[PDB]
Amino acid sequence: MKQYLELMQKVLDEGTQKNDRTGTGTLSIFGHQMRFNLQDGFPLVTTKRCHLRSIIHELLWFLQGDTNIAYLHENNVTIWDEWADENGDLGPVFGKQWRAWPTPDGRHIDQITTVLNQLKNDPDSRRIIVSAWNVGELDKMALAPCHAFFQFYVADGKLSCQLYQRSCDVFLGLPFNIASYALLVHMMAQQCDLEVGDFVWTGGDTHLYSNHMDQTHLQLSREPRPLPKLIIKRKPESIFDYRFEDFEIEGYDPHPGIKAPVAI
Amino acid sequence: MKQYLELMQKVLDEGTQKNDRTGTGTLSIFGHQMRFNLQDGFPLVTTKRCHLRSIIHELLWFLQGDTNIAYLHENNVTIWDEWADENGDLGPVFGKQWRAWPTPDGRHIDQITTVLNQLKNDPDSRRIIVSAWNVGELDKMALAPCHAFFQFYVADGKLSCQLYQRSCDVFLGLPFNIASYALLVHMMAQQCDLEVGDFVWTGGDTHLYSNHMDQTHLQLSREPRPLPKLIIKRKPESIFDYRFEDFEIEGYDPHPGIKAPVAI
Ligand SMILES: C#CCN(Cc1ccc2[nH]c(N)nc(=O)c2c1)c1ccc(C(=O)N[C@@H](CCC(=O)O)C(=O)O)cc1
Ligand SMILES: C#CCN(Cc1ccc2[nH]c(N)nc(=O)c2c1)c1ccc(C(=O)N[C@@H](CCC(=O)O)C(=O)O)cc1
Ligand SMILES: Cc1cn([C@H]2C[C@H](O)[C@@H](COP(=O)(O)O)O2)c(=O)[nH]c1=O
Ligand SMILES: Cc1cn([C@H]2C[C@H](O)[C@@H](COP(=O)(O)O)O2)c(=O)[nH]c1=O
């Protein structure tokens, strides 16, 4: 997509060499923002084939409040295998914080239900927020949440959402993150009877790994195709009752997929 | 400042009318980012006089972990009076979350000390984060944290910082927020022996209140002056041992101050 390749090129032109946790090395910039008007089409990258099955099931998994990879395996999704322990557990990552953030006084707060209540009863609120960044449980998480914090906003009958992502693998992770949150905005808007507005992505350490350079040069030689359209076929009773089969991505005609290793 | 007046004008040109919590009404945009290179000068607005005393003492107060306004009063700072209860308390807002985030298992985490340790031992880390957004204590806070989440980044010997601000009063609050975080970056860099890099500000609901319009038009008619320079006169033993007297802002020559009411 145009915004996405512009970011790739910016990182190549302006990124500084940085060592990283994984020992791979990156080119890195700090602080970037882009905006996707969801009415223009579903922001799924077309200059390489993205695996929609993994994208959709990962989100349905977050929404169940699940942090064990068994559900993903049952559905032949293997994107989280490297970080799971021997029991398939990741610790209280995304889904657990979204659905059941534990309090000091022994309560569990379901942030997704709170948001739905705010959207339905106080849409002008400037506090419609979900955070995965639970300081008190970081030490138990397999990986600290990279997409850490997001905010909804309603104006003129449209639902917008901004994500803060502290750390972004531009080549592997970012195409998934964009499509994942665009999907959630479409689901939330359907449930609240709103139109889709903008998805605003904000990055902290936004980087290309040093062993993704050939792949990046390949992809940058490709022309983007027209964006596909997202069709939701059914309106479930709640945000927690969506199924893989409810989504149809129409007119997705990507360039070939590009293999790249993940930095563990 | 140039970036700051450009934002003001953008909100006037592109903002949509939105009702708000306070009942005042705003013009609002969603999602904005600007960058201040701290080597260019200290980003204190010059097209109106800013009260540095309130700015500096509020930060020293956050860093003590204090949430009662008595310290501010002792120093003739009245910016938090409207939201305090009868005992002068605000509940577990900024300072408490920064210094003593309470965990489920009964611990208190000092996020500022953790950050200092990360900067000193793992500067390439993509997880150098402080969050005030403690979901489990929101119901006890006088106002939910508007400057909610920030991240440090080190590259090439320079310290950068990005703030996510969920809600931004462009006229009254923003000049304070910019200068407040620029100050903390200078303090942190001094303590860690780094140079200052960029302060990146990211906003969610970024708005002008309807009863700030005359004031906004006045300020937009003014030419920005050269930025002042921040001098820190002493290197204290720790980040918690700074005093008001340690800071000197040299060459600050603002246009006159502009009175505006705060929306409660
Ligand atoms: C973001 C996110 C979720 N995640 C979780 C996740 C966990 C650790 C990470 N670590 C690093 N260094 N980068 C990542 O983006 C990353 C992502 C993903 C992890 C891997 C793939 C991946 O390897 N995708 C390949 C192959 C897909 C397949 O066919 O199975 C691809 O080509 O896209 C995608 C998403
Ligand atoms: C951000 C922040 C911290 N805060 C906390 C705070 C709390 C609630 C708020 N509520 C609203 N609606 N806008 C604000 O920006 C705001 C700010 C501030 C609050 C008030 C002033 C203020 O009235 N400043 C005046 C007068 C200063 C003086 O002389 O005492 C000014 O002209 O700047 C500044 C900062
Ligand atoms: C889970 C996840 C990881 N990542 C990448 C960012 C980093 O390169 C890496 C996480 O490593 P880090 O914790 O050291 O930042 O995984 C994404 O880009 N998006 C994601 O959703
Ligand atoms: C504390 C604080 C408030 N504000 C403003 C943003 C909003 O206009 C208002 C908070 O109200 P809200 O919780 O309804 O967003 O105060 C700032 O801009 N900066 C700050 O640091």
Side-chain angles (χ1 to χ4, degrees), chain A residues 146-147 165-169 177 203-207 209, chain B residues 126 151:
Chain A
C146 33
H147 45 107
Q165 187 163 346
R166 64 163 183 86
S167 177
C168 178
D169 178 341
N177 293 124
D205 183 332
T206 304
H207 50 264
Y209 279 95
Chain B
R126 298 180 289 221
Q151 184 176 185

Side-chain angles (χ1 to χ4, degrees), chain B residues 183-253:
Chain B
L183 201 59
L184 177 68
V185 177
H186 266 92
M187 291 155 76
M188 280 287 338
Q190 192 189 219
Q191 287 301 317
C192 291
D193 273 84
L194 297 159
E195 296 270 79
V196 295
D198 289 334
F199 174 55
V200 181
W201 180 88
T202 298
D205 183 332
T206 304
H207 50 264
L208 288 160
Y209 279 95
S210 59
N211 62 358
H212 289 176
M213 294 295 149
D214 290 341
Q215 289 95 153
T216 294
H217 291 295
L218 181 58
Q219 192 167 353
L220 284 170
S221 69
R222 296 166 172 189
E223 287 301 306
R225 303 256 167 96
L227 293 181
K229 303 311 169 199
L230 174 78
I231 315 300
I232 311 179
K233 288 156 79 188
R234 173 174 80 95
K235 184 180 180 160
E237 304 226 302
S238 87
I239 194 89
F240 311 113
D241 291 318
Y242 284 90
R243 298 163 193 152
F244 177 76
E245 355 314 317
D246 296 326
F247 307 101
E248 208 50 57
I249 293 83
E250 162 185 288
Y252 184 49
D253 185 25

Side-chain angles (χ1 to χ4, degrees), chain B residues 66-153:
Chain B
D66 197 357
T67 61
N68 183 285
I69 62 174
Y71 169 88
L72 299 179
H73 283 6
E74 268 175 45
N75 287 112
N76 310 294
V77 172
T78 59
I79 56 163
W80 277 106
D81 287 6
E82 283 89 348
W83 300 273
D85 68 18
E86 309 58 55
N87 307 136
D89 283 313
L90 294 172
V93 296
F94 302 102
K96 160 86 183 304
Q97 306 304 155
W98 286 14
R99 293 304 310 290
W101 175 291
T103 70
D105 50 51
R107 303 170 308 157
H108 296 277
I109 294 160
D110 184 340
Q111 292 182 84
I112 298 303
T113 286
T114 299
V115 156
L116 277 165
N117 283 148
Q118 296 174 123
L119 286 172
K120 287 175 185 285
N121 291 280
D122 197 14
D124 295 316
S125 177
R126 298 180 289 221
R127 312 169 167 187
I128 312 176
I129 289 167
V130 178
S131 174
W133 195 265
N134 189 159
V135 169
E137 305 218 291
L138 283 173
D139 47 353
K140 287 153 26 70
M141 291 175 198
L143 207 59
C146 33
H147 45 107
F149 190 98
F150 55 101
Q151 184 176 185
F152 298 95
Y153 171 93

Side-chain angles (χ1 to χ4, degrees), chain B residues 146-189:
Chain B
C146 33
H147 45 107
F149 190 98
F150 55 101
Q151 184 176 185
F152 298 95
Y153 171 93
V154 183
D156 300 319
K158 297 161 142 83
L159 186 59
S160 289
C161 176
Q162 176 166 198
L163 169 63
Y164 193 89
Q165 187 163 346
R166 64 163 183 86
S167 177
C168 178
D169 178 341
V170 170
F171 185 91
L172 268 188
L174 187 56
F176 271 58
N177 293 124
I178 297 168
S180 189
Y181 279 84
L183 201 59
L184 177 68
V185 177
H186 266 92
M187 291 155 76
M188 280 287 338

Side-chain angles (χ1 to χ4, degrees), chain A residues 12-30:
Chain A
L12 281 174
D13 293 348
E14 295 178 31
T16 76
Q17 308 214 4
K18 205 172 169 250
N19 267 262
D20 82 288
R21 177 180 57 77
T22 76
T24 310
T26 65
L27 279 176
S28 169
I29 67 172
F30 186 64

Side-chain angles (χ1 to χ4, degrees), chain A residues 28 30-31 35 151 153 164, chain B residues 28 30-31 35 124 151 153 164:
Chain A
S28 169
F30 186 64
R35 180 182 303 260
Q151 184 176 185
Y153 171 93
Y164 193 89
Chain B
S28 169
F30 186 64
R35 180 182 303 260
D124 295 316
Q151 184 176 185
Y153 171 93
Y164 193 89

